[PDB]
Amino acid sequence: GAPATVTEQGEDITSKKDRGVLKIVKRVGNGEETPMIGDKVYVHYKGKLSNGKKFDSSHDRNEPFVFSLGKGQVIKAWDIGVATMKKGEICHLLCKPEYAYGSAGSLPKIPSNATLFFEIELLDFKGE
Numbered sequence: 001g002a003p004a005t006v007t008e009q010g011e012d013i014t015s016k017k018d019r020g021v022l023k024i025v026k027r028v029g030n031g032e033e034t035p036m037i038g039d040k041v042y043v044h045y046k047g048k049l050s051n052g053k054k055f056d057s058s059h060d061r062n063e064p065f066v067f068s069l070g071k072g073q074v075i076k077a078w079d080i081g082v083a084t085m086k087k088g089e090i091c092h093l094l095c096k097p098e099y100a101y102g103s104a105g106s107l108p109k110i111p112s113n114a115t116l117f118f119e120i121e122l123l124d125f126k127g128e
Contacts, residue, residue, distance in 0.1 A: 003048070003117040006094040013084055020099040021077045026119070029086025035125035037070030041082050042124040048117045055109045055116075064123050075100045077116070085122040093118045 002024075010022030035041050042064045047056045058065045067073040069082055077095035085091060095116045097103065105112040 001052070002092055002119070003050070003052070003094055006092050006117070010092070010094055013080060014099070018096075018098075020096045021080050022094045023081060023084065024092045025089060026092055027088070027090040027121075029089035029122065031087055034086060035069050035083060035122075036127070037083065038128050039069050039125045040066060040128065041069045041122065042066050042126075043082065044121040044123060046119045049110070050115050050117075068128070069125070077118075078120075081118075081120065082122060085120070087122060087124060090119065090121045093120060 006022045006024050010024050012019050012021070013023050014020045043066075044058045044064055045056075046059070047054065049055055070079050072079065075095065077093060077099040080099070081091065081093045081095075095118065097113045097115060100116045101110050101114060103112050105114060110116070
């Protein structure tokens with residue numbers, strides 16, 4: 001399914017090229033610009049564990065999740081991944097623990113040393 005397709009065909013968007021964040025675009029955005037570090041970004045997401053089980057979604061609060069890009073307000077994989085997205089884009093990200101919650105996890109929802117899958121939609125971005 002989708003996570004195995006990211007494993008097998010995803011683009012490595014990390015600077016080190018350690019496969020820490022792999023990406024597949026699912027829906028093109030509009031406009032060619034991506035957010036700059038420091039921009040406010042507005043996302044919907046669905047997050048699944050390696051066995052396919054949901055661990056979280058913005059839709060659980062029925063509102064977009066809002067954060068400042070590149071400030072470490074989110075896991076590393078999001079600061080990297082969202083920066084690559086255009087407004088309106090939907091992508092799939094597979095995120096190794098080093099770029100997510102590491103050996104600590106976020107228990108019980110996220111186990112130790114968990115590779116995470118996200119489907120993320122970049123709804124909007126705005127400058128600071």
